[PDB]
Amino acid sequence: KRRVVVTGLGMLSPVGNTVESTWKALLAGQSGISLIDHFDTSAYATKFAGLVKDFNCEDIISRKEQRKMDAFIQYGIVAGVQAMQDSGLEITEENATRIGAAIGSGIGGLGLIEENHTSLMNGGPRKISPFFVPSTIVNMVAGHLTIMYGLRGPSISIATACTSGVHNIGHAARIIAYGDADVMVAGGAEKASTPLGVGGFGAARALSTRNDNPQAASRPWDKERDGFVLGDGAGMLVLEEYEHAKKRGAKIYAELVGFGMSSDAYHMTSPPENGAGAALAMANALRDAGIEASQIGYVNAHGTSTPAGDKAEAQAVKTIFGEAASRVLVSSTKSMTGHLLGAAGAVESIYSILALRDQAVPPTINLDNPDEGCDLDFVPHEARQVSGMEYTLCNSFGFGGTNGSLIFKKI
């Protein structure tokens, strides 16, 4: 069987603009949530989000090209450039047809959609920009990177809401394991902290309104949570066949061994109380990797800090692990970064990988009072050093009941 390993990392997050700075901030329990300042939030119930601070893509994307792409596309391009550079891969004309991408987004270019529709409502269709469609649709990140690096392999884009980041990575490995490609740039990008984004998520009553303390708003598994916090950024991995990577002398962070999928078949936005879909996804990832739940040392949980979602995921983990439920570690980095939506499963996969490299686990901050009856250790407040951790599991659940899980093995 063709084995898939990760040979490159790239990331933009509300707590850092590189992989290592983000990882440092996550291990220190740093919050990247702050008040929104790019649009007026007087009438909005939520006035804060996890924003990307001091974003500079001018050295990679020219201003003429910047105007042709939404912010989430710029995030995905920057993270993809970081991952390609971190892999050191050399694109030749014999290499081209074997290297592709699998990068997606949950909602895509809301910001430029609003801008073009505002021009339309003000001055008709003649004021719409000719770049409207190619600047907003979710696959254009994969489009630009393939043009920038001359990648001629398979390019797909999975947009499964908050699960995109995991699915895009998983099937990238599948595309490698099947033989359609030797290298794949996979991940997701998201920038939904727009008027439509914040307003629409607040209309569904899914956002936190803790405006008086935004850094304490994201409280996964805590008794006083009141919805999730929006986050922006992008995560990119470089997946490679194992023999192709050793022959090239690449750096190898970890191996991607498990990928499971499932559907809740329940509700369009809420998960079932028992968490049957999350458990099915984790069990399929286990069986696809060929391990047991006990062999999992760390689970980077979805942990959106919603009342129903946290309980459902904790119940699903308890079901899947059983005796090892008191043993296995679980934490939610969304307590620090917020919810990056289609990029969540991307950046959190990176965290799962880096845990196995540094044998450390980022915490679940703001976890003052855990839920009653829940006996899980969510690594509260402070990070925790661990040893012997050979497997990590990353979860992602999205609207429509779609679920995905990834398992990573050391070296």
Partner 1 sequence: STIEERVKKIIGEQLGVKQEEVTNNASFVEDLGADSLDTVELVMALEEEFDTEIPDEEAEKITTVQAAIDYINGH
Site for a copy of itself in 285-304 (CB under 8 A): 288
Q: How far apart are CA 379 and CA 330, in angstroms?
A: 7
User: Is residue 302 annotated as part of the catalytic site, yes or no?
Assistant: yes
64 binds, among Na ion, a copy of itself, partner 1, none (CB under 5 to 8 A by kind): partner 1
When binding is defined by CB under 5 A, the residue of 41, 237, 348, 355 that contacts Na ion is 348
**Known binder of ligand: residue 167?**
no
Minimum gap (Å) between residue 347 Cβ and Na ion: 9
Q: Which two tokens stand for residue 139?
A: 């696959």
When binding is defined by CB under 8 A, the residue of 60, 95, 195, 386 that contacts a copy of itself is 195
Q: Is 63 in the site for partner 1 (CB under 8 A)?
A: yes
Stretch 114-133: interaction string toward partner 1, x if CB under 8 A: ------------xx-xxx--
Q: Is 107 exposed, middle or buried (0-12, 13-18, 19+ CB in 10 A)?
A: buried
User: Is residue 339 annotated as part of the catalytic site, yes or no?
Assistant: yes
Please report which helix (H) or strand (E) contains residue 156, including its range: strand 155-156
Map the footprint of a copy of itself across residues 57-116, applying CB under 8 A.
68, 96-97, 100-101, 104, 106-107, 113-114, 116
When binding is defined by CB under 8 A, the residue of 86, 222, 255, 264 that contacts a copy of itself is 264
Q: How far apart are CA 293 and CA 284, in angstroms?
A: 11
Q: How far apart are CA 263 and CA 318, in angstroms?
A: 19
When binding is defined by CB under 8 A, the residue of 37, 64, 147, 373 that contacts partner 1 is 64
Between 46 and 304, name the residue whose CB sits nearer to Na ion.
Answer: 304
Q: Which two tokens stand for residue 177?
A: 């394991």
Closest CA to 127 of 110, 137, 115: 115
With CB under 8 A, what is the number of residues at the site for a copy of itself?
87
SS3 of residue 168 by DSSP: helix
Sole window of 58-66, 106-114, 174-182, 344-352 interacting with partner 1 (rule: CB under 8 A): 58-66
Q: Is 265 in the site for a copy of itself (CB under 8 A)?
A: yes
Number of other residues whose CB lies within 10 A of the CB of residue 368? 12
Tell me how far CA of residue 175 lies from CA of 143, 306, 334, 377, 396, in angstroms: 17, 34, 29, 36, 20
Minimum gap (Å) between residue 362 Cβ and a copy of itself: 28
- Active-site entry in 162, 167, 171, 244: 162
Q: Is 270 in the site for partner 1 (CB under 8 A)?
A: yes
**Known binder of ligand: residue 146?**
no
Closest CA to 9 of 342, 176, 330, 254: 254
Stretch 385-404: interaction string toward a copy of itself, x if CB under 8 A: -------------xxxxx--
User: Is residue 394 annotated as part of the catalytic site, yes or no?
Assistant: no
Q: Where are the beta strands (DSSP E) in 335-401?
A: 360-361, 384-385, 391-397
- Determine contact, residues 208/125, Cβ cutoff 8 Å: no
Please report which helix (H) or strand (E) contains residue 339, including its range: none
Q: Which residues bind Na ion (CB under 5 A)?
A: 300, 302, 348, 394-395
Catalytic sites, residue numbers? 162, 302, 339
